Design a protein around this ligand. Structure first.
Ligand SMILES: *[C@@H]1O[C@H](CO)[C@@H](O)[C@H](O)[C@H]1NC(C)=O
Ligand SMILES: *[C@@H]1O[C@H](CO)[C@@H](O)[C@H](O)[C@H]1NC(C)=O
Ligand SMILES: [Ca+2]
Ligand SMILES: [Ca+2]
Ligand SMILES: [Fe+3]
Lengths: 511, 638, 638
């Protein structure tokens, strides 16, 4: 069946029809075909797939957020990797490139000319403006007005020129397409090379793509976080932040995800990098970064469980949300419930803690772990097998369920592995604080559980915590999935995960 | 085109060039000097407000006329005298100028007892039984009608209201004051329905009407009565040393009230500014116009702010270029001294038209009484809208912002019957807000003939700066609610409100366990309400703000929370204040706790059959509100 | 992609390949042969319907369990005997198998009078006073509960219900039948609120419960009683020649009923198909599952149609490619024989969730009883939706279309208490429709033990063709309401309804003029309602159909007309049937006319103070509905 691909401007349109022709000859009629849809911007492509006019289009990690938002509802299905085919990389470096001996650093960018890849882009907007956000003059909302006053002249593609003229001073109208002289990675570098801007925010591979001469490449410098300038070749040592790779998005329901990857897998094996001289998948004589990025070496399949918020991660999703809204004693701990009985005991615990601990229920045990990831949940109790799965996603355990009665239960931990309370990295301080006060009020008590509340007692058997637990012991060391379980247990559940694989474990291993 | 910061500065610049004191002084002219409801002077100012609204070039300006019944002191003056055990003797105390509206009007005689404020708690502590005797109470803490209601319940024959020197430091002791004893809002002769000629005015009367005569007397007249009484008043009450407890066995008081009813025409005049995106949704800004006396603090300020906010916002639309997403209605209410009649009759008549269309009411009455502190009584949802405005508006006297107390939400007082915002929140289910630059002690010359412009200037020197600050707070409420496509109604706030109710009910967990009742269902009802707001908060996070359709589907769910708290089990005619948090009735949540307080004392006052029903409906009211908030009709669990 | 004509043909093709008779026969198996409410056989078919819905791959399938109280004939059998003036004598008449649910259950004795049908009109024509005596009435014309209610009002001690040969040509004269005497709908022990464990089941009882014992007896048992009675029944009543008027002065009847209450679990199972444009708006299709006897005509047909319509519509979405703009919910109700309990408890529990979200209810119960004529009872708004369907669907026996009578709208009968669609229209305010391929005479074996599949096949030879025609009419209702972006709810139709009410009130214009009342305000209220629909009709004409936002603002105004006819003055707990056109109460429009009929007879039954209030609220109910329909809140005139 045919797959409608969305193309931006004339440049991507010409590469699309050429891609449709070259693929038609090598692949039979029974196989997949490629169709092309004309669109003015990337935003028009997202609205097209949602309206069933197109099927798939590649976007930047920072533009995936926009595609996730209702009523577009797009999920990343195929992600491209950079570097080499032997060693795939699902993340690229974002750096700031300036001219040699300019006399400006990372902390001093006010009243300076800037060149961005595009509004909403990872390396061109989300990161560069993100570090300088809480240093911007009031007000901070809207975001575009503060950048307009910070930089004397800027060129940020896909931006409203009528409301913010200063962001389209270097590039009139702010074109979202290749039709604009300064668009994307290669366009933002051309904004620096021509002498229009003082600083350009692009990728680490952008310099090598535009300049081939070794003498010409030493005419630039990279700004670091500690206000220092390091060599262009040294990008691993000096960079802003590591961002997720570009990915192709499709509809969550009925977005033929299995048909699109079946098309792109055959595209890289016939017209990929260093495969054919007639047509290249990651290179075009009409322009740079068309359809797919020139720095890409292949494609990789994105697990079904992994959604757009999971693809970017908590660290990046929160950064975008705070960048648009305007945000620079502990908050209630949202506990995750599995069954009807667990949330019934949770609701009674919520009232007794006086709003210190809330309750959010999920369908299965695996679904609760995903909620702690994006921020819907905060903490929950899990057995040793699930601690390995939660730990591989990025959740560290803080408390251990002790079944032995001792003098100092909270001071000394138990080895047994036992059930552990896992939580998000940023809530480590709060969870270990609030729950410790709850044990002093509802922990070990007399047979008065008929009148008063008892945390370690359930209506049936093992609800929020196990019934044979004395107290939840705090870990002295910062234990991870490997530190808590031990070197012997990790290898045990790892080999068992090979035959019995869950959807969440495969999704967290992707990154 | 224009953002929040552009709007903040454009409003502030208009406020600096606006003269408030000149407007309040113009309303206190000899032409509008006395503004009794349905009087010539009331209509005169009404025509003035109509023309002024028409001069500001608003979208539409219309008037609504009602024919309501009020009570007035006619030919026969009311008198209070002391008599002997056999007949008329003693001496004539006073013939008051002032009176209490909607009084029984009957001649009564008997022993006199000081009930102090007249609070249900005050009566319970009285060592002297109030049964079959006239009670005298100080003005304050509560409503007159509340004062009378508490007395009538203990079988009192009548009620006398006076102002002590301690609470009311007034020089003149011969000064009389006005009030009303109707326990409710609106016209008491047209409950549930509007006072239009369409209803033909059928024979119907409100249950809130008192069955005993009520009269207000001066400080001097009270001291004359104390002279004939014996027994020193307890140090618990902050009152004068003249205060006496009961009359002697030889002499007792005789009160006679003879007020008659009068049919009058009330004019309610409105002004609207149509929105560009959703004109059908609107925020209402109301202000009282009528006053028994001169009314400078009661209605003088409020009406001045109403006219000026309607001016400033109209100039921002036409001249500046401000485009409100939702409409704004300015309302000049009449007959407010009689229990917010004009406003309640409008809500009772166009109830269907503003169902889920009106999302907020801002009240401008009594916004300026002092200068010490800033007090606001509103719905939980507007809590966050206020908090944000408090840390943005500076105090008129000092330099600091209004946001100084972090735990200000817990010190917020509930809306009372005398407030014009009460009918909007408890009857209609529209979140309302009433703010004040109040003082520690209430305004002394409030319901008196000394509510003049001169007295307002003397007490508040920098009146112009405080009125500008008042209009700035009210002005930012309008902006915030009509500027952004996202509603500023915080549904999240309420969870603290439900948690508070269940914690108070958790204290009596032993008494509930004794009966064949469990509390686990109320824990889930509360929990499900959190999960509903949490799901809605994430649903706002995963949606595009620029899209009109997705947002409207989400904002309509927010506009239903206040409605879903109105009890759907009680008749709106008999129990108009349906709201379960801030209403009056056995249906309300506080009443459920109050009824269970009688259980712990083991007396014959606790009704078990009533409590089992009270708990049943309230559990489902909170649950139903939770189920309707998120997950549609199939995504719900239980 | 697909239009109306494409949908009409795709539905018809699926109907031709669908075998109905095989499904009805499968439901009449020994496994589901007896389906009493809350029984094992009822749950068995419930689990079957749940699994079947899950097999059709619908969007979501969920169940709701209620714990309601019903009445059953237990250990002590009820008996009817004739006794002498001093004590027990005569002979034992019959011990009935059948009983009447929600009966008082008490032993009573006294004189017997034939009230015929038991209509309030029947009692008024009786030459024999019914006060203090047991009455016997034929089944028909009205509800049992209505029959009992009319008798209890005239102080009758008890009620006997039988089936004559004339109205019910049944061979077996020993046959017994079932029914219920509760004047209302839903669980009578949980009025206003749902029967969930959340409510803790408090001590509360419905006013609709009878205070006198009721029993059903067979034709043979009645003839035995007539043998002891004297006086020939008047030719006015179409009844048997055995019919006798009153018992002799020597002997009288003694009825004893001893039924007990039983708590049972009811399961309501639903199936939904999510819409693509507006999933939150949905149309509900319901059908009764339980039956006292075998139930072939009562619930056999209805449940068979429910399952097949859910199959056909699911296949059109998944396979054909049909995209509904609004959701469709299929509902299998239980405890319907006891007064549509399952359906009313669902409406009482999720009232807030379906407020202005559910816009139509389609009832499939008793859709097939005969073959002669097609009868439909529905709201005025669905009138045009039906008219269009009638001239599109052909009759199963003949070749002609169902649309033959042009003035069919005027011959439409109001929905009754026994119908499952009544609670939806009168309590919730959701337009409901109930259609039938009925006969001149009602189905004889309806509430009996002879409601078998065999008897249905013998009476209706071509059952498969009539069930297909029934599903076709119901199927086109769903399509039309979910296919187009414009709602097919005709608000225009109602004007005829209001005109009819004012013309009937205009006949008594002299009596109104005599009192201090005018009718001019009701003329305007009616007129303003026309102008409101006329303005809305033009507003649809001047708007683009493809635009989502403009249409949604207009369709929401259409969804509010039925709601605005529910009285906002009466308590939904005491008077659940708030609807002023088709409800029960002093609040309804018919009751206003019925009360004024007593005025012309000059007797002491007309209440002037009640009539002045009745007229006041109703005038404003029609006016308020008019004002809220068009012109927003400022474009209104008066
Ligand atoms: C309304 O009724 C009042 C009497 O209560 C009368 O004076 C007035 O003229 C009437 N107005 C209309 C429009 O009927
Ligand atoms: C509900 O109450 C009934 C008794 O009326 C009991 O049998 C049943 O187990 C209860 N179910 C729940 C969930 O409480
Ligand atoms: Ca009224
Ligand atoms: Ca119920
Ligand atoms: Fe990128």
């Amino acid at each position: 069946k045919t797959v409608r691909w969305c193309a931006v401007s004339e440049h991507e349109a010409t590469k699309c029809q050429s891609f449709r022709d070259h693929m038609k000859s090598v692949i039979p009629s029974d196989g997949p075909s490629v169709a092309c849809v004309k669109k003015a911007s990337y935003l028009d492509c997202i609205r097209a797939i949602a309206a069933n006019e197109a099927d798939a289009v590649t976007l930047d990690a920072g533009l995936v957020y926009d595609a996730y938002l209702a009523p577009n509802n797009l999920k990343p299905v195929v992600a491209e990797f950079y570097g080499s085919k032997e060693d795939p990389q699902t993340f690229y470096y974002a750096v700031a490139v300036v001219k040699k001996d300019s006399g400006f650093q990372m902390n001093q960018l006010r009243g300076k000319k800037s060149c961005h890849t595009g509004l909403g882009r990872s390396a061109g907007w989300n990161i560069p403006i993100g570090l300088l956000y809480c240093d911007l003059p009031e007000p901070r909302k809207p975001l575009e007005k503060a950048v307009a006053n910070f930089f004397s002249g800027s060129c940020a593609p896909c931006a409203d020129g009528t409301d913010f003229p200063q962001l389209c001073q270097l590039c009139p109208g702010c074109g979202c397409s290749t039709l604009n002289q300064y668009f994307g990675y290669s366009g933002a570098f051309k904004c620096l090379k021509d002498g229009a801007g003082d600083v350009a925010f692009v990728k680490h591979s952008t310099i090598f793509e535009n300049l081939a001469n070794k003498a010409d490449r030493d005419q630039y410098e990279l700004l670091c976080l500690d206000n220092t300038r390091k060599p262009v070749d040294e990008y691993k040592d000096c960079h802003l932040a590591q961002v997720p790779s570009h990915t192709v998005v499709a509809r969550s329901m009925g977005g033929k995800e299995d048909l699109i990857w079946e098309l792109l897998n055959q595209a890289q094996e016939h017209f990929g990098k260093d495969k054919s001289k007639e047509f290249q998948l990651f290179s075009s004589p009409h322009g740079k970064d068309l359809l797919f990025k020139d720095s890409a070496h292949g494609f990789l399949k994105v697990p079904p469980r992994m959604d757009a918020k999971m693809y970017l991660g908590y660290e990046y999703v929160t950064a975008i949300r705070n960048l648009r809204e305007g945000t620079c004693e502990c908050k209630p701990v949202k506990w995750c419930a599995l069954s009807h009985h667990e949330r019934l005991k949770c609701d009674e615990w919520s009232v007794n803690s006086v709003g210190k601990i809330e309750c959010v229920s999920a369908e299965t045990t695996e679904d609760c772990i995903a909620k702690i990831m994006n921020g819907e949940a905060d903490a929950m109790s899990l057995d040793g097998g699930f601690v390995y799965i939660a730990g591989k996603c990025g959740l560290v355990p803080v408390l251990a369920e002790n079944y032995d009665k001792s003098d100092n239960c909270e001071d000394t931990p138990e080895a047994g592995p036992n059930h552990a309370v896992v939580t998000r990295k940023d809530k480590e301080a709060c969870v270990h604080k609030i729950l410790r006060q709850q044990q002093h009020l509802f922990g070990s008590d007399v047979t008065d559980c008929s009148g008063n509340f008892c945390l370690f007692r359930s209506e049936t058997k093992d609800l929020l915590f196990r019934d044979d637990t004395v107290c939840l012991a705090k870990l002295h060391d910062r234990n991870t999935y490997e530190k808590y379980l031990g070197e012997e247990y990790v290898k045990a559940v790892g080999n068992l995960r090979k035959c019995s694989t869950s959807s969440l474990l495969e999704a967290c291993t992707f990154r | 085109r224009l953002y929040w910061d552009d709007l903040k500065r454009k409003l502030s610049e208009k406020l600096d060039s606006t003269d408030f004191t000149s407007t309040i002084k113009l309303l206190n002219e000899n032409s509008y000097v006395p503004r009794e409801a349905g009087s010539q002077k009331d209509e005169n100012l009404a025509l003035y407000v109509e023309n002024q609204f028409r001069e500001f070039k608003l979208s539409k300006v219309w008037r609504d006329q009602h024919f309501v019944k009020i009570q007035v002191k006619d030919s026969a003056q009311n008198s209070v005298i002391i008599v002997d055990k056999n007949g008329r003797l003693v001496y004539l105390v006073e013939n008051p100028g002032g009176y209490v509206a909607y009084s029984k009007a009957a001649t009564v005689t008997g022993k006199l007892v000081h009930a102090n404020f007249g609070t249900k708690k005050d009566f319970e502590d009285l060592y002297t039984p109030v049964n079959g005797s006239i009670v005298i109470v100080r003005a304050g803490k509560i409503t007159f009608a509340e004062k009378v209601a508490n007395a009538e319940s203990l079988n009192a024959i009548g009620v006398l209201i006076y102002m002590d020197q301690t609470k009311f430091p007034i020089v003149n002791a011969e000064l009389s004051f006005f009030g009303h004893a109707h326990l409710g809002t609106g016209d008491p002769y047209t409950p549930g329905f509007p006072s239009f000629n369409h209803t033909q005015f059928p024979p119907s009367r409100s249950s809130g009407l008192p069955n005993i005569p009520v009269q207000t007397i001066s400080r001097a007249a009270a001291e004359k009565l104390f002279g004939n009484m014996e027994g020193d008043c307890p140090s618990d009450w902050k009152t004068d040393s003249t205060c006496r407890m009961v009359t002697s066995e030889s002499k007792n008081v005789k009160l006679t009230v003879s007020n008659v009813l009068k049919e009058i025409k009330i004019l309610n005049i409105f002004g609207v500014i149509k929105g560009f995106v959703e004109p059908d949704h609107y925020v209402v800004v109301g202000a009282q116009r009528d006053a028994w006396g001169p009314g400078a603090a009661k209605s003088g300020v409020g009406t001045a702010l109403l006219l000026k906010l309607a001016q400033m916002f109209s100039d921002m639309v036409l001249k500046d270029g401000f485009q409100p997403s939702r409409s704004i209605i300015f309302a000049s209410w009449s007959a407010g001294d009689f229990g917010s009649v004009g406003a309640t009759e409008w809500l009772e008549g166009y109830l269907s038209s503003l169902h889920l269309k009106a999302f907020t009411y801002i009240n401008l009455d009594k916004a300026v009484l002092g200068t010490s502190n800033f007090k606001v009584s509103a719905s939980p949802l507007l809590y966050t809208l206020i908090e944000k405005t408090m840390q943005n508006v500076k105090h008129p006297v000092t330099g600091q912002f209004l946001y100084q107390d972090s735990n200000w939400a817990s010190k917020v007082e509930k809306l009372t019957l005398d407030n014009a915002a009460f009918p909007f929140l408890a009857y209609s289910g529209i979140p309302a807000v009433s703010f004040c630059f109040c003082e520690d002690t209430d305004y002394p010359y409030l319901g008196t003939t000394m509510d003049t412009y001169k007295e307002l200037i003397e007490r508040i020197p920098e009146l112009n700066k405080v009125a500008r600050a008042a209009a700035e707070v009210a002005g930012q409420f309008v902006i915030k609610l009509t500027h952004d496509v996202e509603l500023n109604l915080d549904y999240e706030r309420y969870n603290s409100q439900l948690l508070s109710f269940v914690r108070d009910l958790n204290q009596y967990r032993a008494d509930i366990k004794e009966m064949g009742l469990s509390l686990q269902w109320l824990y889930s009802a509360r929990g499900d309400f959190f999960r509903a707001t949490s799901r809605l908060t994430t649903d706002f996070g995963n949606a595009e703000k620029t899209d009109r359709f997705v947002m409207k589907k989400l904002n309509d769910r927010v506009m239903r929370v206040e409605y879903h708290f109105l009890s759907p089990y009680v008749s709106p005619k008999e129990s108009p204040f349906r709201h379960v948090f801030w209403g009056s009735g056995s249906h309300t949540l506080p009443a459920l706790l109050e009824n269970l307080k009688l259980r712990k004392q083991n007396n014959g006052a606790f009704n078990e059959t009533l409590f089992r029903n009270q708990l049943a409906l309230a559990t489902w009211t909170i649950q139903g509100a939770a189920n309707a908030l998120s997950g549609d009709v199939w995504d719900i669990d239980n």
